[PDB]
């Protein structure tokens, strides 16, 4: 970077210190702060196994093995746990899982088309996920397919309707038993009436939700005492 000889500092878009000259060699050197990943943990559930796989979210793991450091979490796990089972993804790199060329359904989503699972001397495998069974429809200029049989299917669909109605008292939540706190809360105005109005509007709205879903009839209809509907069992 040409650095305009009186200038000493360099900034990026977000005004953070980017390129510094050498003060006596007079050469331009970048600043890239070495930092910053996230550890993500792949587990199959602790009832089934206790072995894990570890994703580092944004790195080359030619440069994994150095450090975790906060209080006493430490390099001493890491110095030979780099080893083998190192696989580089586009979502970071993954340690403790072995890549295969098979393509399965997604079980635990790593990201960027990679999923992981636990099977087969059991182990964690990582694979490229498959979209479905391959199929080719026999298209022709004069050929049609007509069904000769059928199937009655019953499926279920779950939908939420309402949630829990909650209301608040401000003075008991914030102050409680002391009167001087209520006198200081009095100087802060009417935030509490606004919060009570908001929660009251939510609690009215939940009963309105249940009444629009379920009360679509005006009369209560009864089934007959006999239950014969041509062979259909509704019990």
């Amino acid at each position: 970077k040409k650095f305009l000889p009186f200038q000493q500092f360099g900034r990026d878009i977000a005004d953070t210190t980017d390129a510094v000259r050498d003060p006596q060699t007079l050469e331009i050197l970048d600043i890239t702060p070495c930092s910053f990943g996230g550890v993500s943990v792949i587990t199959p559930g602790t009832n089934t196994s206790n072995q894990v796989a570890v994703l580092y979210q944004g790195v080359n793991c030619t440069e994994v093995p150095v450090a975790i450091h906060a209080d006493q979490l430490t390099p001493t796990w890491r110095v030979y746990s780099t080893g083998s089972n190192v696989f580089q993804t586009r979502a970071g790199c993954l340690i403790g899982a072995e890549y295969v060329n098979n393509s399965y359904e997604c079980d635990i989503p790593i990201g960027a088309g990679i999923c992981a699972s636990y099977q087969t001397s059991q182990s964690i495998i990582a694979y490229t996920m498959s979209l479905g069974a391959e199929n080719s429809v026999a298209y022709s200029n004069n050929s049609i397919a007509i069904p000769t049989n059928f199937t009655i299917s019953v499926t279920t669909e779950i939908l939420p309707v309402s949630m829990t109605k909650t209301s608040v008292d401000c003075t008991m939540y914030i102050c409680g038993d002391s009167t001087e706190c209520s006198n200081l809360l009095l100087q802060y105005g009417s935030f509490c009436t606004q919060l009570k109005r908001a929660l009251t509007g939510i609690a009215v709205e939940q009963d309105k939700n249940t009444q629009e879903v379920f009360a679509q009839v005006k009369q209560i209809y009864k089934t007959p005492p006999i239950k014969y509907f041509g062979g259909f069992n509704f019990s």
Partner: protein, 99 residues
């Protein structure tokens, strides 16, 4: 933005996988019609299903079969105008740009 604690995570489905999904949906709706979304895919020729879609809007199917070449030419010229119009006027994709 990376160096201040903020991460962009990649999506689970890549663009090739989404393109394979839309290719499967296109090949299903050309070779089978509406039948692949309600069960197994049953094949039908394309002017016969276009006759079915004219019966869906209240026009008898001989209007298709006696005008098949004209309807095919109108459809092909309409697709070509879609590509030429979408190549120009650079504010048609403002909804995806705003995100």
């Amino acid at each position: 933005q990376k160096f201040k604690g903020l991460t962009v995570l990649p999506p689970l489905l890549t663009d090739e996988m989404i393109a394979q999904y839309t290719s499967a949906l296109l090949a299903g709706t050309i070779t089978s019609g509406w039948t692949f979304g309600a069960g197994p895919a049953l094949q039908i020729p394309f002017p016969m299903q276009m006759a079915y879609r004219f019966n869906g809007i209240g026009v008898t199917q001989n209007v298709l079969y006696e005008n098949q070449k004209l309807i095919a030419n109108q459809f092909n010229s309409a697709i070509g105008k879609i590509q030429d119009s979408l190549s120009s006027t650079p504010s048609a994709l403002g909804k995806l740009q705003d995100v």
